[PDB]
Amino acid sequence: ADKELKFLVVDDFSTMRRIVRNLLKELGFNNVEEAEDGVDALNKLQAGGYGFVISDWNMPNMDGLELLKTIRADGAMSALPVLMVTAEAKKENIIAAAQAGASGYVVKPFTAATLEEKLNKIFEKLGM
């Protein structure tokens, strides 16, 4: 994929956001921004230019599933790739993510190699 692809990392925990930003750096993607919850993320996504969203599940104000569903129901950004991050491989969340249109999911904590495999599958599916 284009190494200048613009990523939005959404998570209410600063450490976790920084960890994801740094793993993406390890994989060669340095054009990354951060958001603290679904509200902040939607506001930033309106600014435009984003090409990929990695969003945590549990956040205050607006959680990850709600953000995903809101993205999917929008006009302009409806097809944006969205990788959901979850704390456990819980069946109802994995099913809910899939049925809501997530591009994939990944369980934290995850490594650079796991992140890379997840991103490649998505790139493959969307032809990136």
Partner 1 sequence: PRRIILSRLKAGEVDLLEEELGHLTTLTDVVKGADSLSAILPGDIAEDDITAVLCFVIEADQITFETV
Helix axes 64-73, 38-46, angle to 10 degrees: 30
Asked whether residue 58 is marked as a ligand-binding residue, the answer is yes
Asked whether residue 2 is marked as a ligand-binding residue, the answer is no
Asked whether residue 40 is marked as a ligand-binding residue, the answer is no
Pick 12 or 117: Cβ nearer Mn ion: 12
Which helix (DSSP H) or strand (DSSP E) does residue 60 occupy? none
Name the residues that contact partner 1, by CB under 8 A: 89-91, 94-95, 98-99, 102-105, 121
What pairing do the DSSP bridges indicate for beta strands 52-56 and 32-35?
unpaired
Q: Which does 25 bind (CB under 5 to 8 A by kind): Mn ion, partner 1, none?
A: none
Question: Does residue 34 bind Mn ion (CB under 5 A)?
Answer: no
Pick 44 or 69: Cβ nearer partner 1: 69
CB 30 to partner 1: min, Å: 26
**Strand order through the sheet with 104-107:** 32-35, 7-10, 52-56, 82-86, 104-107
- Exactly one of 12, 36, 74, 116 binds Mn ion (CB under 5 A); that residue is 12
Q: Which two tokens stand for residue 125?
A: 């599916």
Q: What is the binding site for Mn ion (CB under 5 A)?
A: 12, 56, 58
